[PDB]
């Protein structure tokens, strides 16, 4: 069959790697989510500035 | 231990680590692309600010 010690060590190592990789993915994902929210707000404010600017320009003519 | 159990857990942990690694590399890649776009956009914005203030100051 297998080597008991070897698969135990691989098991512990895979659990450690999965904890590290999970934390890294949850952190990168969280930063991505914050960036998406900030994206929404900035796009709203930009749209507002575009509308003000075009109202000014159109009402100049 | 239980040989079958730790073999199954090892296979499952390897699959989970592949999925989680792929997810982290994809999310990280999107973050990096967003950082590059951040740099370029900040450059262009700075340029527009400078043009605008030059116009306003010369008024």
């Amino acid at each position: 069959s297998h080597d008991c010690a070897k698969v135990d060590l691989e098991n512990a190592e895979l659990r450690r790697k999965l904890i590290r990789t999970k934390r890294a993915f949850e952190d990168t994902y969280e930063k991505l989510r914050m960036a998406n929210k900030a994206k929404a707000q900035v796009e709203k404010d930009i749209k507002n500035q575009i509308l003000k600017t075009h109202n000014v320009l159109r009402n100049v003519r | 231990h239980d040989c079958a159990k730790v073999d199954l857990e090892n296979a499952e942990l390897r699959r989970k680590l592949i999925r989680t690694k792929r997810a982290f590399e994809d999310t990280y890649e999107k973050l990096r692309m967003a950082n590059k776009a951040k740099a370029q956009v900040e450059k262009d914005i700075k340029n527009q600010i400078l043009k605008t203030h030059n116009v306003l100051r010369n008024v």
Partner: peptide, 27 residues
């Protein structure tokens, strides 16, 4: 219906707020 000096003022105010807004994008 605005005279030239008024147009200048309105454009200037819009431009000033746009400068401030872009600057706020850098933050």
């Amino acid at each position: 219906r605005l005279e030239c000096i008024d147009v200048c003022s309105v454009l200037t105010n819009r431009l000033e707020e746009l400068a401030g807004f872009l600057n706020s994008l850098l933050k």
